[PDB]
Amino acid sequence: SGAIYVGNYRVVNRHLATHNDWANLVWEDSSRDLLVSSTTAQGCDTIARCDCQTGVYYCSSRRKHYPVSFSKPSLIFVEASEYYPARYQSHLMLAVGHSEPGDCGGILRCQHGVVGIVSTGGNGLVGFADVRDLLWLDE
Ligand SMILES: COc1ccccc1S(=O)(=O)N1CCC[C@H](C(N)=O)C1
Numbered sequence: 001s002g003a004i005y006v007g008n009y010r011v012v013n014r015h016l017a018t019h020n021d022w023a024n025l026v027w028e029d030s031s032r033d034l035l036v037s038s039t040t041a042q043g044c045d046t047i048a049r050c051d052c053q054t055g056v057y058y059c060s061s062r063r064k065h066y067p068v069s070f071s072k073p074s075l076i077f078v079e080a081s082e083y084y085p086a087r088y089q090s091h092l093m094l095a096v097g098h099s100e101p102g103d104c105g106g107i108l109r110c111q112h113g114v115v116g117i118v119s120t121g122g123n124g125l126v127g128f129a130d131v132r133d134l135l136w137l138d139e
């Protein structure tokens with residue numbers, strides 16, 4: 001679990017969005033595993049606007065943060081799960097690291113701010129849904 005709170009927006013994994021997220025929907029993209037809902041309170045986070053390929057992510061299944069080198073956002077094949085059929089997930093960045101299903105929502109950050117959230121895992125890999133291209137989150 002986990003979310004990004006920026007301005008009057010809440011960013012979560014689309015497969016973990018609640019009834020309340022869907023009732024206050026701003027934007028969603030099944031191919032990216034992202035959903036953004038509106039909030040009444042002002043958020044605690046800042047979004048990175050950069051091309052960093054290193055950062056640190058929070059891993060709930062280890063209660064620890066890990067430093068990672070990750071690929072640029074791209075179209076990557078992801079196997080079928082309880083939440084999605086087998087498909088290509090877009091705007092995904094892979095890194096070598098630990099990730100279990102419940103780790104989705106952990107934040108990846110660089111020195112500039114929030115880069116994205118955990119969205120995929122297994123096999124000693126961790127995949128993050130990028131949010132740096134969503135410029136409207138800042139206004
Ligand atoms: C071992 O599998 C994981 C580990 C960490 C995280 C996720 C998995 S998952 O592949 O089960 N996963 C389930 C949730 C939706 C996700 C997606 N983005 O398509 C896929």
Ligand SMILES: [Zn+2]
Pocket residue numbers: 048049050051052110111112113
């Ligand atoms: Zn950066």
